[PDB]
């Protein structure tokens, strides 16, 4: 809407206080005009109609329990925007400052979040498997990264190309979590998953097998569930990305780590310059090798480490 930019204050899903960019016109709206063509957060009101209504608040204070998922969806969308702009010189998900829209309170007891082709959508969880999923910065950045992928490589959401799609979202979700520097790790969704169980998460990038996901191409799932295992076989690529950044020896193959920043540069270049809608794992390896060569040189440690990491997970 048309109005003046304001700064509200509220509490997120985990009880932390943060400032949020709002817009005043009669009400205070979750509309951040400081980033691109805006970040807009909507109330789906426990229904499945999208986007719902632009979030309106009478006093610019967002401390009610019902407000918490909206605060975090709005704030973490901003952090993710900042990561892509400051780190990769990318202006929003389309590179042209497209408005970023999110809806919270989607459905009832909904244990998921997604990008629907046009916007981000967050369930509240059932209180047992999940609390409201926008409480996870890695979750928010994972979802917005799907938008980046759709506008760049366009990886089809099935089989190997879909597992790469998923891994790209886990990689950049994790790099955004490190960028914000609040309890960062290489696991996915730990801040909103199973409030009754400490130390778990949906997936691990450093040890995908911790939660049953493959860490080597020979262990890949080839059935039809989960669009051909997109959230399962992502573990193979997530492990390679972890090894590239942090190093390690995996199935007897040693990888010299090169750090998170170079991981991000290599995979961002691969995603935006070399990957295609039907890229498979072998083609991802080639794209990462070429990207590392462009950035650091053919004889660089960075190129050597990309090759070792894909060797370690059985991807040639």
Ligand X SMILES: Cc1cc(CN)n(C)n1
Catalytic residues: 143, 231
Given 78, 228, 264, 314, the residue binding ligand X (CB under 6 A): 228
Rounded least distance, CB 146 to ligand L4Z, Å:
6
State yes or no: 187 annotated in a binding site.
yes
Q: What are phi and psi of 249, to 5 degrees?
A: -115, 125
- Per CB under 5 A, 149 contacts Zn ion: no
Judged by beta carbon distances under 5 to 8 A according to partner kind, the member of ligand X, Ca ion, Zn ion, none in contact with residue 193 is Ca ion
Contact between 204 and ligand X by CB under 6 A: the answer reads no
Using CB atoms within 10 Å of the CB of residue 191, give its burial: 0 to 12 exposed, 13 to 18 middle, 19+ buried.
buried
194 annotated as a binding-site residue: yes
Distance CA 175, CA 160 (A): 22
Q: Which does 302 bind (CB under 5 to 8 A by kind): ligand L4Z, Zn ion, Ca ion, none?
A: none
Q: What are phi and psi of 39, to 5 degrees?
A: -115, 125
Q: Is 138 annotated as a binding residue?
A: yes
Residues 170 and 39: their CA atoms lie apart, in Å, by 22
Among 112, 129, 272, 301, indicate the residue that binds ligand L4Z (CB under 6 A): 112
- Residue 100 has φ and ψ, to the nearest 5°, of -105, 120
Is 24 an interacting residue with respect to ligand L4Z (CB under 6 A)? no
Of 48, 96, 183, 218, the residue at the interface with Ca ion (CB under 5 A) is 183
Residue 231 interacts with ligand X (CB under 6 A)? no
Dist CA 310 CA 292 (whole Å)? 13
Q: What is the crossing angle of helices 68-88 and 159-180, to 10°?
A: 100
Q: Which residues in the 164-193 window bind Zn ion by CB under 5 A?
A: 169
- Please tell me the total number of residues recorded for the chain in this structure: 316
Q: Between 58 and 87, how does the x/- string for binding to Ca ion read (CB under 5 A)?
A: -x-x--------------------------
Q: Are 115 and 121 in contact (CB under 8 A)?
A: yes
Contacts to ligand L4Z by CB under 6 A: 112-114, 142-143, 146
């Amino acid at each position: 809407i048309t109005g003046t930019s304001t700064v509200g204050v509220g509490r997120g899903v985990l009880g932390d206080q943060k400032n949020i960019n709002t817009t005043y016109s009669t009400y205070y709206y979750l509309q951040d005009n400081t980033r691109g063509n805006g970040i807009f957060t909507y109330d789906a009101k426990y229904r499945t109609t999208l986007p719902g209504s632009l979030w309106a608040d009478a006093d610019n204070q967002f401390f009610a329990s019902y407000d918490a998922p909206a605060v975090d969806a709005h704030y973490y969308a901003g952090v993710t925007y900042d990561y892509y702009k400051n780190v990769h010189n990318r202006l929003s998900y389309d590179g042209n400052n497209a408005a970023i829209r999110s809806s919270v309170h989607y459905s009832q007891g909904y244990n998921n979040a997604f990008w629907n082709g046009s916007q981000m959508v967050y369930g509240d969880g059932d209180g047992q498997t999940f609390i409201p999923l926008s409480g996870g910065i890695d979750v928010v950045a994972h979802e917005l990264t799907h938008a980046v992928t759709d506008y760049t490589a366009g990886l089809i959401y099935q089989n190997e190309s879909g597992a790469i799609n998923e891994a790209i979202s886990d990689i950049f979700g994790t790099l955004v979590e490190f960028y914000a520097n609040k309890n960062p790790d290489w696991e996915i969704g730990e801040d909103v998953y199973t409030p009754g169980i400490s130390g778990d998460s949906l997936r691990s990038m450093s040890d995908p097998a911790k939660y049953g996901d493959p860490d080597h191409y020979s262990k890949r799932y080839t059935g039809t569930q989960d669009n051909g295992g997109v959230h399962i076989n992502s573990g193979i690529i997530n492990k390679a990305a972890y090894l590239i950044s942090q190093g390690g020896t995996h199935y007897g193959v040693s990888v010299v780590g090169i750090g998170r920043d170079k991981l991000g540069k290599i995979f961002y270049r691969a995603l935006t310059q070399y990957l295609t809608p039907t890229s498979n794992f072998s083609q991802l390896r080639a794209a990462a090798v070429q990207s590392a060569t462009d950035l650091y040189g053919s004889t660089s440690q960075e190129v050597a480490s990309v090759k070792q990491a894909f060797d370690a997970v059985g991807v040639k």
